[PDB]
Amino acid sequence: GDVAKGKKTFVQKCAQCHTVENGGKHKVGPNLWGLFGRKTGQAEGYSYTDANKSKGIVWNNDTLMEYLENPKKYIPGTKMIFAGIKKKGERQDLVAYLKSATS
């Protein structure tokens, strides 16, 4: 898991819609501070869809790796409109960074 390459991905692919830092604003999507170890649909102040709220699983390495490959198949109904990151190595690196930058 390479945190410098995952950071590049994030800025490329996610940053338009998300922030990571403590305090960080909700943009199109929620801020993601806290996210590991949290159940889905849990960032304070954000209005999620009832899908992302009710999925009910906890965000950890394994589940973030599955969700990122295809977000709409994992959360049918999500308003996170983004196709996925298909390649396993870029997903690892990108998970390895979120881990770092969200606590």
Residue numbers at the binding site for ligand HEC (CB under 6 A) = 13-14, 16-18, 28-30, 32, 35, 40-43, 48-49, 51-52, 68, 78-82, 85
Which residues does residue 56 pair with via DSSP β-bridges, in sequence order?
A: none
- Residue 54 annotated as binding? no
Task: Give the Cα separation of 86 and 39 in Å (integer).
Answer: 24
Nearer to ligand HEC, 16 or 103 (CB): 16
Considering the complex, what minimum distance in angstroms separates the CB of residue 77 from ligand HEC? 7
- Residue 26 annotated as binding? no
- Residue 80 annotated as binding? yes
Contact at 8 Å (CB) between 78 and 71? Answer: yes
Task: Give the Cα separation of 94 and 78 in Å (integer).
Answer: 20
Tokens 């992302």, residue located: 52
Report the binding-site residues for heme c: 14, 17-18, 80
